[PDB]
Design a protein around this ligand. Structure first.
Ligand SMILES: *[C@@H]1O[C@H](CO)[C@@H](O[C@@H]2O[C@H](CO)[C@@H](O)[C@H](O)[C@H]2NC(C)=O)[C@H](O)[C@H]1NC(C)=O
Lengths: 44, 49
């Protein structure tokens, strides 16, 4: 029931090794079975 | 309701608030405050961090 997010930002699939450090452990406690990215459509 | 100022003690309106404690399968998120003590260094102490 904890939705854990890890994140990392690299300047410049690139070769190399970089580990991801935990970001936010949310106590959502919900079922997650589908996922979909949401984008921003700038009218300008 | 008969909220008259001249009513008796048993008839005067009173504010009542009911608290419900619900335990669910989801992780608990409303816990009581935790008391903490001072910090003792360079001594054999029983600790809890
Ligand atoms: C949507 O597009 C507009 C137009 O390109 C963006 O406005 C520009 O914002 C940049 C900074 O990111 C400024 O340097 C430009 O001068 C802006 N242009 C104008 C015409 O004002 C706007 O930021 C975009 N919207 C979002 C939410 O990023």
């Amino acid at each position: 029931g904890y939705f854990k997010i890890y994140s990392k930002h690299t300047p410049i699939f690139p070769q190399g090794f970089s580990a991801l450090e935990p970001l936010v452990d949310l106590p959502i406690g919900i079922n997650i079975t589908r996922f979909q990215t949401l984008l921003a459509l700038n009218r300008s | 309701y008969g909220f008259r100022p001249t009513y008796g003690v048993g008839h005067q309106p009173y504010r009542v608030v009911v608290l419900s404690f619900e335990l669910l399968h989801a992780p608990a998120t409303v816990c009581g405050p935790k008391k903490s003590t001072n910090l003792v260094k360079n001594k054999c102490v029983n600790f809890n961090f």
